[PDB]
Design a protein around this ligand. Structure first.
Ligand SMILES: CCCCCCCCCCCCCCCCCC(=O)OC[C@H](COP(=O)([O-])OCC(O)COP(=O)([O-])OC[C@@H](COC(=O)CCCCCCCCCCCCCCCCC)OC(=O)CCCCCCCCCCCCCCCCC)OC(=O)CCCCCCCCCCCCCCCCC
Ligand code: SF4
Ligand code: FES
Ligand SMILES: [Zn+2]
Lengths: 112, 118, 125, 95, 148, 94
């Protein structure tokens, strides 16, 4: 086990593989409540499964960080927490719905 | 009725017969470089600063004096057009005096401004 | 949720502009005339808003041109006449609008210089 | 040259001088009015005209890249000299 | 014949041609176009090896400079510009980098003027540069050494 | 530079360094205040031919932005993940 993650305020995780399986599984369950054809569901399920496959395949924490390519394993866990929080918020926002409103005629015309 | 179709950089524009190449370009918002041409004077065609390439035509035409023809595509930003302007500007500045600091035209001079742009 | 506000937009009390420089001023909405010293037409493309000219006097010390008019240099650019008018309405300024002056299309003919029987024939090239 | 107005105030090379009754001359009381005494109009007129044997001559002000932009002067008129529009040196054609 | 240096086959406007081309070239419009010249008026000006080829062409540019009507910019200013450069090439008072500059200048005159006089003043220069570049570069080298 | 031997030893001992070899006051090792004139080089555009400005005009090659989507498959990231940094062989630990 590492002595430190090197980032102030990010504590070393005793059981990183177990924590990552729990978080990715929670993300996938939350994604199951998003509409099937929503792009957020399709892309996030795709990337979440890929990371989950690496977590199962590779038991060595040093080697797992090499595959995931997302920093320290504690940075990966934090990112999975962030994604899980985002998924819950996306359900209430529902950004897969059509555009709320077109902008005025030349709102984005530069130069004027 | 009698409008003929020409193209400016591939954009179609309908003009009356007798419209010049220079006037056809104005209808799409482009201003051809000029010195001798003035819309209220008779056409001269001597400065040669308005030379412009007609697509698939070997020779550049004086846009101010050349009537357009049906189907012509006027390449107003072509490599041939741009190199014609550079040559003409170079001849204009060969004998011109280094006077801009003492010349009243400085700052509102078409020679200065078209040298900068073309 | 949205609300219905059935008034003309008016922001003069939330712009910070002093009373004097809202109702005594006269904005002019126009397209600038081509500088007749040059043939380029690129400065005649946009609409401008400018205010009425006020006094400029000579500084006693150096003779510089002094001003008490905060809007002397204020010039605004607009894409269309409607945009300029809408900006003046909501700011409370009295304005005068002037139609854009586009040059007339001319009939040009190089061959007219050599007419057999017309006066357009030139005597020199 | 530096004249003195009837009041006694020096006239500058731009012709400036406060007239009588102009209060602004109070600013020089107990002090002085800064006037450059080397009038360029007088100094340039002391340079002799240069005789050259050609219709056209060039002037850069002297000193190469330390002078002014190089201009070419026409000397065809014999009723006058050719003057440099930058430095005011005069040229005349030698017969 | 072995003394032949160059021939102008159709008046001053047509580019010169060296002796080798003159060995077999036929005198007609199409054949002389293939030899990168032209029939022109069919005035054959013959120059032998005692000729100063650079000076001979330079006098031709001086002719066109004296004849340009002055109406249009590329010939009014360009031909006179070429005349000054050619005059310097006669003495070698120039650098080799100016040869390709002279070639570029003539191409700016050619095809950009009102009439064909501008073309007629650019072709003689192109013919000289095309066939006698070593003569030009050899005169510049000679001038440079006498001025050290 | 004018300090005596004893003072040089005293202040060298006090600081723990050899101060005389790296004096903070400048003496004769600095450049002369009169220098020979330069002759600066010229840039690549100083050519008499093959130098048409239209072929070396950076401003006129700038284009308006490319519209990807206007309101008129594998997931992606803005770029590949950043490669991890390596410890200095020069001195990993200060
Ligand atoms: C109470 C205490 C005061 C009373 C005692 C007064 C002592 C005599 C003072 C003489 C100093 C001036 C020496 C001199 O000739 O001037 C040189 C100077 C020209 O010499 P320079 O070439 O420019 O530089 C000299 C050295 O090369 C550059 O300087 P330097 O760094 O190389 O030093 C040179 C010299 C300068 O020092 C002295 O000569 C006097 C030493 C007195 C030490 C007292 C403590 O010292 C030495 O040579 C080494 C031995 C000196 C004793 C060192 C002991 C260090 C303390 C122990 C370390 C731990 C500290 C904790 O001439 C002057 O400018 C004279 C100006 C007058 C100075 C004031 C002198 C009077 C002081 C007050 C008197 C009482 C009232
Ligand atoms: S090219 Fe023809 S029209 Fe133009 S200046 Fe020369 S002679 Fe005159
Ligand atoms: S504007 Fe002068 S040739 Fe056309
Ligand atoms: Zn001068």
């Amino acid at each position: 086990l590492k002595k430190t993650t090197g980032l102030v305020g990010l504590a070393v995780c005793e059981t990183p593989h177990e924590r990552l399986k729990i978080l990715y599984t929670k993300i996938l369950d939350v994604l199951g409540h998003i509409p099937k054809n929503a792009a957020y569901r399709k892309y996030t399920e795709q990337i979440t499964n890929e990371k989950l496959s690496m977590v199962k395949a590779e038991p060595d924490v040093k080697k797992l960080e090499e595959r995931l390519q997302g920093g320290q394993i504690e940075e990966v866990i934090l990112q999975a927490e962030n994604e899980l929080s985002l998924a819950r918020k996306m359900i209430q926002w529902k950004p897969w719905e059509p555009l709320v409103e077109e902008p005025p005629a030349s709102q984005w015309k530069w130069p004027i | 009725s009698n409008l003929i179709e020409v193209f400016v950089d591939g954009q179609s524009v309908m003009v009356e017969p007798g419209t010049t190449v220079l006037q056809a370009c104005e209808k799409v918002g482009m201003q051809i470089p000029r010195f001798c041409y003035h819309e209220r004077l008779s056409v001269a065609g001597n400065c040669r600063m308005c030379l412009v390439e007609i697509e698939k035509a070997p020779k550049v035409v004086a846009a101010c004096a050349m009537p357009v023809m049906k189907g012509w595509n006027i390449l107003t930003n072509s490599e041939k057009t741009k190199k014609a302007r550079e040559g003409v500007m170079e001849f204009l500045l060969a004998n011109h005096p280094l006077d801009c600091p003492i010349c009243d035209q400085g700052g509102e001079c078409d020679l200065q401004d078209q040298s900068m742009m073309f | 949720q949205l609300i219905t506000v059935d008034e003309k937009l008016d922001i003069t009390t939330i712009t910070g502009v002093p009373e004097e420089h809202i109702k005594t001023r006269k904005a002019r909405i126009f397209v600038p005339a081509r500088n007749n010293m040059q043939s380029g037409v690129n400065n005649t493309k946009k609409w401008k808003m400018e205010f009425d000219t006020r006094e400029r006097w000579e500084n006693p010390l150096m003779g510089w041109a002094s001003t008490a008019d905060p809007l002397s240099n204020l010039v605004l650019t607009f894409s269309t006449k409607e945009d300029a008018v809408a900006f003046a309405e909501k700011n409370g300024w009295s304005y005068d609008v002037e139609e854009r002056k586009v040059p007339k299309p001319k009939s040009k003919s190089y061959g007219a210089n050599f007419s057999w029987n017309k006066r357009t024939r030139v005597s020199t090239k | 040259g530096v004249r003195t107005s009837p009041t006694g105030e020096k006239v500058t090379h731009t012709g400036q001088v406060y007239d009588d009754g102009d209060y602004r001359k109070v600013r020089f009381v107990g002090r002085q009015k800064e006037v450059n005494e080397n009038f360029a109009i007088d100094l340039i007129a002391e340079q002799p005209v240069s005789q050259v044997g050609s219709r056209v001559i060039s002037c850069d002000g002297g000193g190469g890249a330390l002078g002014h932009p190089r201009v070419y002067i026409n000397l065809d008129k014999e009723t006058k000299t050719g003057t440099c529009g930058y430095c005011g040196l005069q040229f005349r054609q030698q017969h | 014949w072995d003394n032949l240096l160059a021939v102008i086959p159709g008046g001053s406007s047509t580019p010169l041609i060296p002796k080798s081309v003159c060995e077999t070239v036929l005198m007609d419009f199409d054949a002389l176009i293939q030899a990168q010249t032209g029939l022109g008026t069919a005035a054959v000006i013959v120059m032998d090896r005692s000729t100063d080829i650079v000076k001979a062409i330079a006098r031709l540019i001086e002719f066109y400079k004296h004849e340009s009507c002055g109406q249009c910019t590329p010939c009014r200013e360009g031909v006179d510009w070429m005349n000054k450069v050619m005059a310097r090439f006669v003495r070698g008072d120039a650098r080799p980098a100016e040869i390709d500059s002279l070639w570029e200048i003539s191409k700016q005159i050619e095809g950009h003027t009102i009439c064909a006089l501008g073309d007629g003043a650019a072709w003689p220069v192109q013919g000289l540069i095309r066939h006698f570049r070593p003569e030009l570069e050899e005169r510049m080298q000679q001038f440079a050494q006498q001025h050290q | 530079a004018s300090a005596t031997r004893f003072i040089q030893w005293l202040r060298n001992w006090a600081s723990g360094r050899d101060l005389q070899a790296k004096l903070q006051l400048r003496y004769q090792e600095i450049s002369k205040r009169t220098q020979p004139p330069p002759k600066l080089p010229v840039g690549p555009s100083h050519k008499l031919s093959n130098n048409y400005y239209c072929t070396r005009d950076g401003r006129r090659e700038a284009m308006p932005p490319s519209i990807v989507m206007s309101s008129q498959k594998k997931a992606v990231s803005p770029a590949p993940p950043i490669k991890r940094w390596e410890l200095s062989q020069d001195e990993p630990y200060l």
